[PDB]
Design an enzyme around this catalytic site. Structure first.
Site, PDB file in Angstrom:
ATOM      1  N   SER A 134      36.838  53.761  39.909  1.00  0.00           N
ATOM      2  CA  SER A 134      36.545  52.671  40.831  1.00  0.00           C
ATOM      3  C   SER A 134      37.319  52.853  42.131  1.00  0.00           C
ATOM      4  O   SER A 134      38.499  53.211  42.102  1.00  0.00           O
ATOM      5  CB  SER A 134      36.918  51.330  40.207  1.00  0.00           C
ATOM      6  OG  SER A 134      37.003  50.331  41.205  1.00  0.00           O
ATOM      7  N   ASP A 138      33.103  48.269  47.577  1.00  0.00           N
ATOM      8  CA  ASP A 138      32.320  48.953  46.565  1.00  0.00           C
ATOM      9  C   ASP A 138      33.050  48.940  45.230  1.00  0.00           C
ATOM     10  O   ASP A 138      34.283  48.883  45.165  1.00  0.00           O
ATOM     11  CB  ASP A 138      32.035  50.396  46.985  1.00  0.00           C
ATOM     12  CG  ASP A 138      30.904  50.486  47.980  1.00  0.00           C
ATOM     13  OD1 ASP A 138      29.851  49.852  47.730  1.00  0.00           O
ATOM     14  OD2 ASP A 138      31.073  51.157  49.022  1.00  0.00           O
ATOM     15  N   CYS A 166      34.870  20.999  31.802  1.00  0.00           N
ATOM     16  CA  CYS A 166      35.896  21.971  31.459  1.00  0.00           C
ATOM     17  C   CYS A 166      36.561  21.599  30.143  1.00  0.00           C
ATOM     18  O   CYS A 166      36.932  20.443  29.922  1.00  0.00           O
ATOM     19  CB  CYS A 166      36.933  22.047  32.578  1.00  0.00           C
ATOM     20  SG  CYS A 166      38.524  22.786  32.112  1.00  0.00           S
ATOM     21  N   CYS A 221      36.497  21.387  36.642  1.00  0.00           N
ATOM     22  CA  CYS A 221      35.093  21.299  36.255  1.00  0.00           C
ATOM     23  C   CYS A 221      34.866  20.071  35.376  1.00  0.00           C
ATOM     24  O   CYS A 221      35.679  19.785  34.488  1.00  0.00           O
ATOM     25  CB  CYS A 221      34.647  22.564  35.512  1.00  0.00           C
ATOM     26  SG  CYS A 221      34.288  24.004  36.591  1.00  0.00           S
ATOM     27  N   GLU A 253      25.278  50.278  39.503  1.00  0.00           N
ATOM     28  CA  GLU A 253      24.189  49.384  39.119  1.00  0.00           C
ATOM     29  C   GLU A 253      23.128  49.293  40.213  1.00  0.00           C
ATOM     30  O   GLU A 253      21.943  49.537  39.963  1.00  0.00           O
ATOM     31  CB  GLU A 253      24.734  47.998  38.767  1.00  0.00           C
ATOM     32  CG  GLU A 253      23.656  47.103  38.182  1.00  0.00           C
ATOM     33  CD  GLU A 253      24.162  45.722  37.782  1.00  0.00           C
ATOM     34  OE1 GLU A 253      25.391  45.462  37.835  1.00  0.00           O
ATOM     35  OE2 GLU A 253      23.314  44.887  37.408  1.00  0.00           O
ATOM     36  N   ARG A 297      43.318  41.836  37.550  1.00  0.00           N
ATOM     37  CA  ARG A 297      43.267  41.146  36.274  1.00  0.00           C
ATOM     38  C   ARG A 297      43.329  42.121  35.098  1.00  0.00           C
ATOM     39  O   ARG A 297      43.984  41.835  34.092  1.00  0.00           O
ATOM     40  CB  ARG A 297      41.994  40.301  36.223  1.00  0.00           C
ATOM     41  CG  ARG A 297      42.051  39.135  35.311  1.00  0.00           C
ATOM     42  CD  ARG A 297      43.138  38.185  35.710  1.00  0.00           C
ATOM     43  NE  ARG A 297      43.206  37.119  34.719  1.00  0.00           N
ATOM     44  CZ  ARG A 297      43.904  37.193  33.588  1.00  0.00           C
ATOM     45  NH1 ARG A 297      44.615  38.281  33.308  1.00  0.00           N
ATOM     46  NH2 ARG A 297      43.884  36.178  32.737  1.00  0.00           N
ATOM     47  N   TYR A 298      42.660  43.271  35.197  1.00  0.00           N
ATOM     48  CA  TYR A 298      42.413  44.113  34.028  1.00  0.00           C
ATOM     49  C   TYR A 298      42.959  45.529  34.129  1.00  0.00           C
ATOM     50  O   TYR A 298      42.764  46.308  33.188  1.00  0.00           O
ATOM     51  CB  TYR A 298      40.907  44.200  33.747  1.00  0.00           C
ATOM     52  CG  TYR A 298      40.262  42.852  33.560  1.00  0.00           C
ATOM     53  CD1 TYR A 298      40.843  41.894  32.748  1.00  0.00           C
ATOM     54  CD2 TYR A 298      39.079  42.530  34.214  1.00  0.00           C
ATOM     55  CE1 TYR A 298      40.258  40.645  32.580  1.00  0.00           C
ATOM     56  CE2 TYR A 298      38.487  41.287  34.060  1.00  0.00           C
ATOM     57  CZ  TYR A 298      39.078  40.354  33.239  1.00  0.00           C
ATOM     58  OH  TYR A 298      38.489  39.123  33.072  1.00  0.00           O
ATOM     59  N   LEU A 310      39.835  43.366  29.377  1.00  0.00           N
ATOM     60  CA  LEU A 310      38.668  42.551  29.707  1.00  0.00           C
ATOM     61  C   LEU A 310      38.248  41.706  28.515  1.00  0.00           C
ATOM     62  O   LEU A 310      38.060  40.492  28.636  1.00  0.00           O
ATOM     63  CB  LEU A 310      37.516  43.440  30.170  1.00  0.00           C
ATOM     64  CG  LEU A 310      36.149  42.767  30.343  1.00  0.00           C
ATOM     65  CD1 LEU A 310      36.135  41.901  31.593  1.00  0.00           C
ATOM     66  CD2 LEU A 310      35.031  43.799  30.405  1.00  0.00           C
ATOM     67  N   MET A 313      39.531  41.316  39.964  1.00  0.00           N
ATOM     68  CA  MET A 313      39.508  41.764  38.575  1.00  0.00           C
ATOM     69  C   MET A 313      39.973  43.214  38.452  1.00  0.00           C
ATOM     70  O   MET A 313      40.621  43.576  37.464  1.00  0.00           O
ATOM     71  CB  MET A 313      38.109  41.609  37.980  1.00  0.00           C
ATOM     72  CG  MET A 313      37.756  40.177  37.562  1.00  0.00           C
ATOM     73  SD  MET A 313      36.113  40.051  36.802  1.00  0.00           S
ATOM     74  CE  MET A 313      35.314  41.521  37.448  1.00  0.00           C
ATOM     75  N   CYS A 331      35.309  29.859  37.918  1.00  0.00           N
ATOM     76  CA  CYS A 331      36.402  29.801  36.944  1.00  0.00           C
ATOM     77  C   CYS A 331      36.618  31.143  36.254  1.00  0.00           C
ATOM     78  O   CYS A 331      37.721  31.407  35.747  1.00  0.00           O
ATOM     79  CB  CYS A 331      36.129  28.701  35.913  1.00  0.00           C
ATOM     80  SG  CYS A 331      36.330  27.056  36.648  1.00  0.00           S
ATOM     81  N   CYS A 381      43.386  24.859  33.078  1.00  0.00           N
ATOM     82  CA  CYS A 381      42.853  24.702  34.429  1.00  0.00           C
ATOM     83  C   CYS A 381      43.531  23.551  35.157  1.00  0.00           C
ATOM     84  O   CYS A 381      43.853  23.662  36.347  1.00  0.00           O
ATOM     85  CB  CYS A 381      41.338  24.488  34.382  1.00  0.00           C
ATOM     86  SG  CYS A 381      40.382  25.916  33.789  1.00  0.00           S
ATOM     87  N   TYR A 395      31.324  55.562  35.156  1.00  0.00           N
ATOM     88  CA  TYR A 395      32.248  55.887  36.238  1.00  0.00           C
ATOM     89  C   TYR A 395      32.147  57.354  36.635  1.00  0.00           C
ATOM     90  O   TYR A 395      32.250  57.673  37.824  1.00  0.00           O
ATOM     91  CB  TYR A 395      33.685  55.505  35.860  1.00  0.00           C
ATOM     92  CG  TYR A 395      33.898  54.016  36.037  1.00  0.00           C
ATOM     93  CD1 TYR A 395      34.141  53.478  37.290  1.00  0.00           C
ATOM     94  CD2 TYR A 395      33.803  53.146  34.959  1.00  0.00           C
ATOM     95  CE1 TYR A 395      34.326  52.088  37.463  1.00  0.00           C
ATOM     96  CE2 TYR A 395      33.980  51.766  35.119  1.00  0.00           C
ATOM     97  CZ  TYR A 395      34.236  51.253  36.373  1.00  0.00           C
ATOM     98  OH  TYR A 395      34.406  49.891  36.525  1.00  0.00           O
TER      99      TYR A 395
HETATM  100  C1  LIG Z   1      33.113  31.857  29.354  1.00  0.00           C
HETATM  101  C2  LIG Z   1      33.093  33.377  29.137  1.00  0.00           C
HETATM  102  C3  LIG Z   1      31.669  33.952  29.036  1.00  0.00           C
HETATM  103  C4  LIG Z   1      31.544  35.222  29.907  1.00  0.00           C
HETATM  104  N1  LIG Z   1      31.589  35.071  31.339  1.00  0.00           N
HETATM  105  C5  LIG Z   1      31.469  36.303  32.222  1.00  0.00           C
HETATM  106  N2  LIG Z   1      31.476  36.422  33.555  1.00  0.00           N
HETATM  107  C6  LIG Z   1      31.347  37.747  33.868  1.00  0.00           C
HETATM  108  C7  LIG Z   1      31.340  38.294  35.298  1.00  0.00           C
HETATM  109  N3  LIG Z   1      31.811  37.301  36.248  1.00  0.00           N
HETATM  110  C8  LIG Z   1      31.842  37.609  37.676  1.00  0.00           C
HETATM  111  C9  LIG Z   1      31.322  36.665  38.545  1.00  0.00           C
HETATM  112  C10 LIG Z   1      31.332  36.877  39.906  1.00  0.00           C
HETATM  113  C11 LIG Z   1      31.854  38.054  40.413  1.00  0.00           C
HETATM  114 CL1  LIG Z   1      31.833  38.263  42.188  1.00  0.00          CL
HETATM  115  C12 LIG Z   1      32.379  39.024  39.552  1.00  0.00           C
HETATM  116  C13 LIG Z   1      32.367  38.807  38.175  1.00  0.00           C
HETATM  117  N4  LIG Z   1      31.252  38.488  32.715  1.00  0.00           N
HETATM  118  N5  LIG Z   1      31.328  37.576  31.666  1.00  0.00           N
HETATM  119  C14 LIG Z   1      31.289  37.749  30.186  1.00  0.00           C
HETATM  120  O1  LIG Z   1      31.168  38.847  29.723  1.00  0.00           O
HETATM  121  C15 LIG Z   1      31.397  36.558  29.310  1.00  0.00           C
HETATM  122  S1  FES Z   2      36.373  25.289  33.525  1.00  0.00           S
HETATM  123 FE1  FES Z   2      36.227  24.981  35.694  1.00  0.00          FE
HETATM  124  S2  FES Z   2      38.181  23.970  35.697  1.00  0.00           S
HETATM  125 FE2  FES Z   2      38.459  24.594  33.603  1.00  0.00          FE
END
Ligand SMILES: CCCC1=Nc2nc(CNc3ccc(Cl)cc3)nn2C(=O)C1
Ligand code: FES
Ligand SMILES: CCCC1=Nc2nc(CNc3ccc(Cl)cc3)nn2C(=O)C1
Ligand code: FES
Lengths: 359, 359
Positions: free
Chosen positions: A66, A276, A342, A339, A283, A100-101, A28, A12, A132, A347, A59
């Site tokens: 980061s 890290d 899903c 899924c 956190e 990603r961001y 994000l 990410m 996912c 996907c 930060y």
């Molecule tokens: C369907 C969308 C709902 C949302 N799903 C979200 N997942 C996360 C963080 N996911 C995450 C998992 C594992 C690791 Cl290693 C790092 C990051 N934030 N978040 C939202 O704010 C809203």
């Molecule tokens: S939600 Fe897991 S495959 Fe689309």
């Protein structure tokens, strides 16, 4: 010699400087695979500007940004040095970072890989356990990239889409746990409770069949098996945001709960991260280990070092790529099953993009 | 010869005949370790009489009662026969059945073990994966028995309180999965999705830090490792009751979701049970595999046979007890840590009961 095999490392990402925070938050909250808020392309910018000072302040508290890109780069360099020796028929190898961001974005990395004229391209998620929300969204971006430009790839694609129990990943975690166990007072070593803390998920994501909690649980079991169950442990979940239900128990409530019940010697393990970032440095290390822990009367709370620059982790990455190349795998068997609940049509399209690749 | 070592096999149990259903439900709703209800002592008999016709009808649909006692007895007899040869210094061995909600009750078994004058007593939960709602409540009943009766035990106690990854348990599941995979049409074998279906838990219990979901996940990972990831799989959750949030996705929704997305060849695996009972014979085999599956247009849905009379499972039980005896363990390391958000004070008393036992 020109690069022959590209390894795209997917994460990410996080803002490198305070000035990057706003666009990081904008990308994000625009991520429809993460959240489908209404009037997305206009409601997300409001959220981004409102939260930028608060997030900049977080930060600032960990040194101004980061460290993800630094660690990813060091890990990638070591991976490449080994692969060039491990797999000379696919050498030279080159790593690419696809965040990603933040920059470099997954789309910018794909452009560079294509410009470099690679023969083969490996989407290597840096999340060992598949969600996912993490690996899935990163893989979607690769599929979407070729769909948006409208042309087909000039390289043969495949993915290493999860690796929750790779034996060298497990050895790295067990090594860092033992090293940290040695830093407790000897009279309290046996008393230490090991809290594996993984990023949580909204229950709406868990309940549609996301494989992440089960894969994180497998990592925890293999680590504790390598440690010969030397200490009691629990798997808890951190980083919940918002008012909806998330998978618990929460890491902070579990720390507080252990303290109030006489368990005041605690070892935190960031089991779902490979380096890290804000979720460990702020956190866990500030909010929980310094503030919360002091309020609750902790005797000793420590955190296992993130995998970061451990050379065995680089060996793990290269071994994963080497095995992936020799097995001619296009993806894990698990990726071929979307899924059960899903609702996102991408996907299945992303899955088919990787399973149908020419070898 | 006088029995020397007693193996108390702990299970919730189920009604053997339709006439047993009412008292089964009464004890179930009186169990404060499993659920908290207002004025339970007058509310539970109301719920019990109200639900008896419905539950008698479910048992009528599977032949008139639960087969748990039959299977537990066969498994216990086979275990004892092996143990007498594995471990002659602790022979003769005798198994006892201690059910939570039907006869013979845990309290009745303890009385008999004491009357038999055993030197050694082993609380052997028949749940491989620990929950405070299953193994925990059974172990509490042992502690409460001696606390209520006011006396101290005349036998040395220890517990095998979990075993989610025992290698012979894993082999039994893998064997039954492979056997059932052979019963699909050959052209569909590769297409089969393996749904590991485990009993769900209320989120209020999950969010307390209950170890069950992580341990169930570990069983799933070891089975799939032994199967070399031959088919895609998901871990899903069944048997939710009531209006509160439970851990999902639900097995029934997951079956329906797969069907509507083109995955019409499904293998169900009861991963948290060791024998048939209402949750397999009625819920999985009738409610989901016959009714739901037909409505959704399944092509083939099958279920791995419960472990039941498999002699390898009896070998697994005896190997567990034998190793437990050789090691002088009183309990797992995991039992020495109560749930971080546990509010029940008996759990610590129960823990101390086992950790403190004279060797
Ligand atoms: C369907 C969308 C709902 C949302 N799903 C979200 N997942 C996360 C963080 N996911 C995450 C998992 C594992 C690791 Cl290693 C790092 C990051 N934030 N978040 C939202 O704010 C809203
Ligand atoms: S939600 Fe897991 S495959 Fe689309
Ligand atoms: C109508 C009954 C109300 C309730 N039924 C419940 N079942 C459980 C979990 N039982 C369980 C069984 C086998 C296994 Cl392998 C794992 C878990 N919790 N629970 C409640 O709190 C209330
Ligand atoms: S609830 Fe898990 S120990 Fe009391």
């Amino acid at each position: 010699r020109k690069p022959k095999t590209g390894i795209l490392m997917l994460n990410m990402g996080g803002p490198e400087t305070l000035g990057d925070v706003h666009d990081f938050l904008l990308r994000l909250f625009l991520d429809r695979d993460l959240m489908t808020l209404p009037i997305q392309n206009k409601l997300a910018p409001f959220i981004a500007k409102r939260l930028t000072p608060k997030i900049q302040e977080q930060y600032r508290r960990i040194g101004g940004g980061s460290p993800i890109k630094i660690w990813t780069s060091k890990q990638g360099e070591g991976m490449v040095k080994l692969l060039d020796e491990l797999s000379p028929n696919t050498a030279p190898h080159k790593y690419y970072i696809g965040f990603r961001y933040v920059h470099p974005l997954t789309e910018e990395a794909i452009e560079e890989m294509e410009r470099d004229g690679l023969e083969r391209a490996i989407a290597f998620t840096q999340y060992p356990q598949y969600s996912c929300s993490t690996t899935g969204s990163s893989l979607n971006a690769i599929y979407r990239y070729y769909n948006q430009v409208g042309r087909k790839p000039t390289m043969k694609w495949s993915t290493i889409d999860r690796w929750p129990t790779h034996h060298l990943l497990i050895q790295c975690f067990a090594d860092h746990i033992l090293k940290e166990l040695d830093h407790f007072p000897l009279e309290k070593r046996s008393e230490v409770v090991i809290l594996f803390s993984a990023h949580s998920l909204p229950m709406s994501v868990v309940n549609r069949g996301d494989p992440y909690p089960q894969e994180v649980s497998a990592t925890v079991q293999k680590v504790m098996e390598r440690l010969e169950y030397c200490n009691p442990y629990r798997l808890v979940w951190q980083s919940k945001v918002g008012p909806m239900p998330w998978l618990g128990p929460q890491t902070d409530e579990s720390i507080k709960g252990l303290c109030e019940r006489g368990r005041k010697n605690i070892l935190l393990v960031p089991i779902a991260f490979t380096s890290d970032h804000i979720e460990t440095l702020y956190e866990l290390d500030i909010e929980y280990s310094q503030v919360l822990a002091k309020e609750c009367g902790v005797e000793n709370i420590r955190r296992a070092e993130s995998l970061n620059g451990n050379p065995l982790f680089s060996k793990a990455l290269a071994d994963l790529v080497h095995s992936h190349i020799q097995s001619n795998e296009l993806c894990s068997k698990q990726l071929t099953l979307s899924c059960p609940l899903c609702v996102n049509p991408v996907c299945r399209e992303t899955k088919s993009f990787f399973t149908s690749q020419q070898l």
